[PDB]
Design a protein around this ligand. Structure first.
Ligand SMILES: Nc1nc2c(ncn2[C@H]2C[C@H](O)[C@@H](COP(=O)(O)OP(=O)(O)OP(=O)(O)O)O2)c(=O)[nH]1
Ligand SMILES: [Mn+2]
Ligand SMILES: [Mn+2]
Ligand SMILES: [Mn+2]
Length: 430
DNA sequence: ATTATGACGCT
DNA sequence: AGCGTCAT
């Protein structure tokens, strides 16, 4: 009743750039704009692997994780842009630099948590309080929410999509109590006004479009963001959760799309998020552990407490390359040459990071995969990272991995290596 | 040959 | 510390 917490304390947004790498290439090359187009890494094997897809191309069935030759079968007019290659490997610097452009704009409105190269969470609770005091109690005009959907509306008592969006927004605004500065629905609405302003600034100052979700926590904001892409934002209220979750497959909620979610489905014999409400907290903890059980008990009621961490910069700076099939590394000279290539890219990125961000990494993580192992990483070992020098880092990585060569010959490497990975970690202020 | 990154939990 | 999971 009056003591039952409802998880409505915060206003949280999730901003995700639409088909980011594609947009970066479309800004650079206007010939690619408003076209079916995709971004690929490499080219010789099956035309390269697609990693990002414009919405025009998605309409033909093109998807990430598809070979370009196969995508061209679905979409013969598909346009392609290739990721830059430096030192023999894909180099993602252009997209990291574009990401910094967007993150710095978002940080003007509120403190952000960089969740990926193209998405960030935003804690808007305080900004919403401020804008509400600036409002002095006037309602919010629909004109302030020109790209916002209200999930679950319209309802009850109409042929076009924009008209649907506007009907739902009108129903939502008509039911707002704008006199209560602590109304969670009002707070979410003001949050959506601010996110309209943030997205407008991003597009004005970079050319890039994005989608966003606004709700009371990170999981609901992420889920909301996906409901109406591209170039739109969605408000998911606390009240919208029972209907939304009643037909939501469990795998759609962030962290449940893998083995844990499959086990929730199998053990409990359910399909949808809302079905979780029928279990006690102790029942869920008994199946899925104390932490997961409490998280699921609260999540299926729309409640989640994970904070938006104040972190705009990545915690790690890494370099990795797969060597699939017959390109696996089988000699010592090969392994050394590629460790050097990775370490040279790492040195360049670390030196730029030190100048930009006033910090130094102190630990080097070396990971490899050996032929025949299904796991991503066959081995991870750390060593000290005391100087930003590529030859030193590559010799140190070789030292930590050389015991993995089971060949009796000094020159050959067996079993051959199908992955190398160098990662700089444990940053200290400098 | 579903690649190149990231974050975070477990023990 | 080293390994696994999840995202995409
Ligand atoms: N190198 C590499 N980059 C990836 C991979 N998967 C995604 N990316 C990059 C390219 C995407 O443009 C970018 C952001 O990913 P998202 O999942 O948010 O998708 P994207 O922004 O492409 O489309 P969206 O409109 O958000 O559905 O991350 C991958 O497997 N390898
Ligand atoms: Mn995106
Ligand atoms: Mn995507
Ligand atoms: Mn994203």
């Amino acid at each position: 009743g009056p003591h039952m917490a409802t998880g409505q304390d915060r206003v949280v947004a999730l901003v995700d750039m639409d088909c980011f790498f594609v947009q970066v290439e479309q800004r650079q090359n206007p010939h690619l704009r408003n076209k079916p187009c995709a971004v690929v890494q490499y080219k010789s094997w099956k035309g390269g692997g697609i990693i990002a897809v414009s919405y025009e191309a998605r309409a033909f069935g093109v998807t990430r994780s598809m070979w370009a030759d196969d995508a061209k079968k679905l979409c013969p007019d598909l346009l392609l842009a290739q990721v830059r290659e430096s030192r023999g490997k894909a180099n993602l610097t252009k997209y990291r630099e574009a990401s910094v452009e967007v993150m710095e704009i978002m940080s003007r409105f509120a403190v952000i948590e960089r969740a990926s190269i193209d998405e960030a969470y935003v804690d808007l609770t305080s900004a919403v309080q401020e804008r509400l005091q600036k409002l002095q109690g006037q309602p919010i005009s629909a004109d302030l929410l020109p790209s916002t959907y209200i999930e679950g509306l319209p309802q009850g008592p109409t042929v076009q999509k924009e008209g649907m969006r506007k009907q739902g927004l009108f129903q939502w605004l008509d039911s707002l109590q704008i006199d209560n500065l602590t109304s969670p629905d009002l707070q979410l609405t003001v949050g959506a006004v601010i996110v309209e302003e943030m997205r407008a600034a991003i597009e004005r100052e970079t050319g890039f479009q994005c989608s966003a979700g606004i709700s009371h926590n990170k999981v609901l904001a992420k889920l909301a963001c996906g409901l109406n892409k591209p170039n739109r934002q969605t408000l998911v209220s606390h009240g919208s959760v029972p209907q939304l979750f009643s037909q939501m497959p469990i795998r759609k909620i962030r962290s449940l799309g893998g083995k844990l979610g499959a086990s929730v489905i199998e053990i409990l014999g359910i399909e949808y998020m809302g079905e979780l409400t029928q279990f006690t907290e102790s029942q869920l903890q008994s199946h899925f552990g104390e932490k997961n059980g409490s998280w699921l008990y609260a999540m299926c009621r729309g409640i989640e407490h994970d904070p938006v961490k104040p972190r705009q910069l990545p915690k790690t700076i890494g370099c990795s390359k797969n060597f699939p099939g017959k390109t696996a590394l089988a000699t010592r000279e090969q392994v050394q040459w590629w460790l050097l290539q990775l370490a040279q890219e790492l040195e360049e990125r670390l030196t730029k990071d030190r100048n930009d961000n006033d910090r130094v990494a102190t630990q080097l993580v070396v990971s490899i995969r050996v032929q025949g192992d299904k796991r991503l990483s066959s081995l991870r070992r750390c060593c000290a990272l005391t100087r930003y020098d590529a030859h030193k880092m590559s010799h140190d990585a070789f030292t930590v991995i050389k015991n993995c060569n089971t060949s009796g010959i000094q020159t050959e490497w067996s079993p051959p290596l199908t992955m190398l990975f160098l990662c700089a970690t444990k940053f200290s202020a400098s």
